[PDB]
Amino acid sequence: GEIAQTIKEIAKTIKEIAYTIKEIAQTIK
Amino acid sequence: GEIAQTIKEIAKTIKEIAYTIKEIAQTIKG
Amino acid sequence: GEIAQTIKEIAKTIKEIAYTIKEIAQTIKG
Amino acid sequence: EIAQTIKEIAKTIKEIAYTIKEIAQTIKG
Amino acid sequence: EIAQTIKEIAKTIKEIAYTIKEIAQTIKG
Numbered sequence: 001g002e003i004a005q006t007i008k009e010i011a012k013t014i015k016e017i018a019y020t021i022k023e024i025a026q027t028i029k
Numbered sequence: 030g031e032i033a034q035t036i037k038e039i040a041k042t043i044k045e046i047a048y049t050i051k052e053i054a055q056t057i058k059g
Numbered sequence: 060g061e062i063a064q065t066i067k068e069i070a071k072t073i074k075e076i077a078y079t080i081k082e083i084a085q086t087i088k089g
Numbered sequence: 090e091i092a093q094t095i096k097e098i099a100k101t102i103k104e105i106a107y108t109i110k111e112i113a114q115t116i117k118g
Numbered sequence: 119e120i121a122q123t124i125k126e127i128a129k130t131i132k133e134i135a136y137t138i139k140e141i142a143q144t145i146k147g
Binding site for chain 4: 061062065066068069072073075076079080082083086087
């Protein structure tokens, strides 16, 4: 359903952000 | 409908953030 | 209601973050 | 549970918003 | 599960909050 699919999309995108910010932390530290 | 529309707006904004943070990571990466 | 108000607060804060990360990208690289 | 979890998310996102503003301010002329 | 997905989002956002603080400390330190 539309609510479930949107929440899944949010969860996936937040995990992408978490991976990118970890890559930034690795480049800097 | 208000809940569906608001969480869609949140999803779109988070996708904007995901693109920008990747641009930042790439500029600083050797 | 509490759920509606919290989701509104989340949406507003994420928009603030999206603008700050765009300002970081602009300051670093334009 | 749902109300409390989304309140926790709202608070954590406000913490992130403060930290990202600190980063933006340090690098800005 | 809606509750479980929102809990997973809350956990990922807490990871992001920690990582961004580590980045801010390395840049400002």
